[PDB]
Design a protein around this ligand. Structure first.
Ligand SMILES: [Fe+3]
Ligand SMILES: [Fe+3]
Lengths: 192, 192
């Protein structure tokens, strides 16, 4: 059975960008729920023995929605850090410059993609087959994990539960918080 | 151009099932935003002259998402009432009994569809071409308004902004609030 991964940092470590309360419901209830629902769904199917990633890459319907959300949220918690934020560094900063000319142009581009990602969704920084970076949006539980040759490097959860407590309807403010928390080390770890 | 309709009741009339705060955000910011967005999208286009319903039934993309959302929310405010709730009445009470055998089976069928309506969504009580009632789920801005011969009779908004402030992650509690508020007069007007 799958388990709810621990949060990589204290429940208040993301303040004042993401609240202790948001983390309590988002990790504690939302993430958790996906884990208990999947655990309940797999027994008696050709999924009980397989990897979380294996399932996400070979299911649909309910099993997919749950397995993919578990994966996406775990990747999301890692995309933030009490020590992230600020300028990108290393290999990712460079690929960012190679593709968008500048960090600022990339940030504007991602913000644009995320603010207009309609409904429950995720906005991703990914690495394509050519080694170049790109930004892609997915709806609901969809994830670049199921794209052969497309490597996820960072994600931002845009479901309303991710920011409603702290920011209500204002996604731009939430995005300002994400940029104060973005984990460039996890990004570079994934890019390399 | 389009305007935000007035709520059919006082900002605190749905208390304690849906809060004054939820109404201020849901009606005052979200509903309003779709209206500003549409008005900002139709000028000098093949939709500037059309009515809301004509636009929703002849667009896609951004224009569809905003027009439909304005329509769906308006229909949602009408599906609630400080004088609604309790047992269904009149023609709809009888049409529910005809399809599901009883009000209780209908309520459990709708609750099941609504709690499992994945991501941002809407659950509708609709009247079909054959005249029989049914429950259908739509995602994001999709609405039965675009299905010929299908008549929307009531809707429950399941986007998380509809209940997060009041119930956080617990859709079942929000659903309990909806049943205390359901507008059977609105439903009977749509049915007849
Ligand atoms: Fe989430
Ligand atoms: Fe809504």
């Amino acid at each position: 059975a799958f388990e709810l991964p621990s949060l990589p940092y204290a429940i208040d470590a993301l303040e004042p960008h993401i609240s202790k309360e948001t983390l309590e419901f988002h990790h504690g209830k939302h993430h958790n729920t996906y884990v208990v629902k999947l655990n309940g769904l797999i027994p008696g199917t050709k999924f009980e023995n397989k990897s979380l990633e294996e399932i996400v890459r070979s299911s649909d319907g309910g099993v997919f929605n749950n397995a993919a959300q578990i994966w996406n949220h775990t990747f999301y918690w890692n995309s933030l850090s009490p020590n992230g934020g600020g300028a990108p560094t290393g290999a990712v900063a460079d690929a960012i410059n190679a593709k968008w000319g500048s960090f600022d142009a990339f940030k504007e581009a991602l913000n644009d993609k995320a603010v207009n990602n309609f409904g429950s969704s995720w906005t991703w920084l990914v690495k394509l087959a050519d080694g170049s970076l790109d930004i892609v949006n997915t709806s609901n539980a969809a994830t670049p994990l199921t794209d052969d040759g497309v490597t996820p490097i960072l994600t931002v959860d845009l479901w309303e539960h991710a920011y409603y407590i702290d920011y209500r309807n204002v996604r731009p403010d939430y995005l300002k918080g994400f940029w104060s928390l973005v984990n460039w080390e996890f990004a570079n770890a994934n890019f390399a």
